[PDB]
Design a protein around this ligand. Structure first.
Ligand SMILES: Nc1ncnc2c1ncn2[C@@H]1O[C@H](COP(=O)(O)O)[C@@H](O)[C@H]1O
Ligand SMILES: Nc1ncnc2c1ncn2[C@@H]1O[C@H](COP(=O)(O)O)[C@@H](O)[C@H]1O
Lengths: 125, 124
């Protein structure tokens, strides 16, 4: 099988099946099930609770600078439901541990391809 | 995958509202919380209280579960809840429910470390 960059973005950052984090254990569950804790604990990770079509649409919205100085990112007009997963103070690989936080913010993504779709999650703002 | 405690929160917690805002609440929420995925779950209760207040019930009044198990706990205070009951006409995947608002003690089964709700047993 093959996984494209667009597909990796879906795995790492999309959860369209829920309107918000479904429990206080959501981040522990998702960081493991989406394979984001294989070799080390990823310290932070954002999941977006919107339809795939609505997130793909951001690649046609506001062109902005990426947090690393590049200029090829896009910011959403809409405010989106997101979960931020952040490592707890006691988290220690291979026993990673996360706190589930909820927010409603604009997102910034980097895009590639035809169709032109997200391949990188830059920030929420 | 999903822990028993996490499943309880998905199935039974909705602190986004103080009470059900619509008679359609159960039809919409039973679907959106995936309780109708493979079949229509015939009964379900949603609790409109904070997670902390519901988890604390596991430190309150020890009581018997409906099946006789002894790990059930009854809330000291009444809580705002919504009862969802499948109708006689309901046919999967078009699951259909009656919504009933209530304010009653809840009875939950508890397990784990920390000791938290994993099962919703009854309201009284
Ligand atoms: N368009 C982009 N594609 C991939 N990575 C980017 C892009 N723009 C910035 N980055 C940087 O890539 C890193 C994130 O890695 P990843 O999200 O796994 O692609 C961060 O250091 C970002 O600043
Ligand atoms: N397959 C089923 N048929 C009828 N009632 C069920 C079924 N599964 C769970 N219940 C009921 O669902 C409620 C919540 O149980 P629980 O999912 O264990 O928190 C209890 O009143 C159970 O009796």
């Amino acid at each position: 099988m093959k996984e494209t960059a667009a597909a990796k973005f879906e795995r790492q950052h999309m959860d369209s099946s829920t309107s918000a984090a479904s429990s206080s254990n959501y981040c522990n569950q998702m960081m493991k099930s989406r394979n984001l804790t294989k070799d080390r604990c990823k310290p932070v990770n954002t999941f977006v609770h919107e339809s795939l079509a609505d997130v793909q649409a951001v690649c046609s919205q506001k062109n902005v600078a990426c947090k690393n100085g590049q200029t090829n990112c896009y910011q959403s007009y809409s405010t989106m439901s997101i979960t931020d997963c952040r490592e707890t103070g006691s988290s220690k690989y291979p026993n990673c541990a996360y706190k589930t936080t909820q927010a409603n913010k604009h997102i910034i993504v980097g895009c590639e391809g035809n169709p032109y779709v997200p391949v990188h999650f830059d920030a929420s703002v």
